[PDB]
């Protein structure tokens with residue numbers, strides 16, 4: 001039994017969500033009060049993502065003899081941080097199912113997070129050599145933009161994109177990019193539109209002239225990036241389509257739901273002459289993404305699942321899932337199990353869960369809710385109406401992270417590219433995977449040999465007048481109506497249209513597809529186009545309040561969709577108990 005080698009429809013896979021939806025959609029209740037208590041623990045963690053695993057880890061650190069149960073509803077631990085695997089040419093090729101890398105860790109990681117890393121044997125400086133930073137640039141490859149015929153009249157791939165991004169693994173001087181005039185000069189847009197885009201870079205103007213800096217900042221917080229471009233910069237509706245999907249990957253929303261002020265902070269163009277006031281290499285990437293963080297914690301917590309120690313041997317270590325949930329062992333991780341009930345009683349907490357359609361009741365002195373926060377009201381019976389409602393307002397964003405095994409990457413080499421941005425297509429981000437050597441694992445190097453592609457699909461509804469919560473809920477409705485066959489068609493259609501001109505043939509050249517469907521992906525985050533900062537902060541703090549011996553974690557609890565928020569919220573929750 002070995003989930004990482006599965007391909008096909010993954011992420012929140014069939015079997016992971018149905019009991020949860022019986023609660024959330026049908027309002028079915030699954031009470032276990034009339035069942036005997038089957039097992040007893042010092043701590044029961046609901047949810048086996050990075051946050052829940054960290055909670056078990058910091059709790060044992062404080063209580064070394066503690067008996068800990070971790071209940072997780074997917075068929076594998078890690079939550080968004082999942083290991084994907086392909087077999088190709090007698091070797092393993094690794095991919096990340098979701099949680100991608102550690103974000104600017106020297107700048108952003110707390111002392112507690114850094115302590116977790118060090119105890120697990122993660123040396124951040126090791127990625128300076130593990131990440132092969134000059135591999136694709138040294139091969140003369142650049143990033144490209146793919147314009148689709150539906151939106152721009154013709155399919156066109158334009159390379160040499162100089163656009164700097166938030167979390168960039170390419171040193172700025174190794175972009176193999178062209179000037180703005182030459183690059184935009186190739187856009188399939190009217191001469192007028194191309195000249196206006198070029199001028200956006202060559203000759204910025206104070207599009208808000210006459211406002212104080214403060215009024216500019218007020219206006220930009222209340223105005224979408226798309227509207228800023230349309231109404232103040234004066235770009236045409238055809239021009240701004242170029243920008244529509246740029247924010248999809250890092251914020252799970254298009255330019256219509258991105259506050260102009262957030263676009264400024266993320267390095268988007270148009271602000272240089274506004275008079276507004278005033279980088280870490282994005283290389284902290286295990287070959288299976290932050291799934292390595294989850295695996296490192298699982299192995300540290302449950303030594304029987306795999307041998308070794310440290311960041312090197314984790315990469316190819318063989319996990320034996322039969323050792324995760326062994327009786328009498330102090331730490332047990334129970335997969336395929338949906339918690340349905342959490343109730344304070346007699347100085348402890350009773351937790352009911354459903355596994356293979358059967359209800360169960362266990363008991364712990366302490367409980368950490370490390371699951372999706374909007375799930376918590378359906379489980380935690382003691383919530384006041386106020387706090388349950390607060391939890392329910394963390395409306396997470398759906399995303400789809402697709403891994404594609406290719407027979408070779410000659411087509412990419414021919415086209416001179418290692419990454420594509422598509423302004424309006426379902427997949428806005430498509431790239432050859434990061435080249436990382438770690439432990440015994442070596443990144444694919446030969447374009448005649450197989451390689452993994454990473455591509456992100458976000459089911460936004462651009463330009464419709466929806467607030468962010470509604471685009472998220474509607475995006476999940478669209479994902480719920482998509483079969484795996486429809487998902488694969490979209491992958492194959494777009495890969496063929498982008499790579500076909502250089503000899504790509506999707507039926508011949510794709511040898512693997514793994515679709516990680518994160519219907520409940522990024523935590524909600526406060527959006528100044530729709531939310532008030534003080535109200536939202538009050539909701540956040542209320543939602544995560546301690547309930548008896550039940551503490552609440554998940555990255556959701558910080559309204560902050562980051563692995564280090566997952567850790568910090570677990571630490572706060574463990575300290576509360």
Ligand SMILES: Cc1cc2nc3c(=O)[nH]c(=O)nc-3n(C[C@H](O)[C@H](O)[C@H](O)COP(=O)(O)OP(=O)(O)OC[C@H]3O[C@@H](n4cnc5c(N)ncnc54)[C@H](O)[C@@H]3O)c2cc1C
Pocket residue numbers: 020046047048049050051052071072073074078079080081097098099100101102103290337338339340370371372375379399400401518520521522523554555556561562563564566
């Ligand atoms: C596509 C994608 C890419 C990302 N990339 C990055 C990145 O590069 N860097 C970064 O820092 N962050 C990234 N993230 C953010 C990611 O959310 C965090 O990194 C981290 O994985 C979140 O951990 P968590 O424990 O808070 O939540 P999760 O990983 O979602 O874990 C919560 C778990 O609880 C489970 N659960 C829910 N209800 C129940 C129930 N009733 N019973 C039992 N279990 C239940 C859920 O199924 C889930 O498995 C990314 C997220 C996505 C979706």
Ligand code: HEM
Pocket residue numbers: 012013016017020021023024025073372374375378392395472473476477479480517519520
């Ligand atoms: C294939 C995966 C999934 C799809 C397509 C999906 C889709 C949806 C949709 C369309 C909604 C209604 C809109 C909303 O309230 O956000 C929803 C809500 C909900 N989802 Fe899922 N979902 C999936 C997986 C999961 C998983 C893995 C969990 C938890 C373990 C979950 C728990 C919930 C809950 C509890 C609600 C109710 C939200 C509330 O009432 O606040 N879903 N989901």
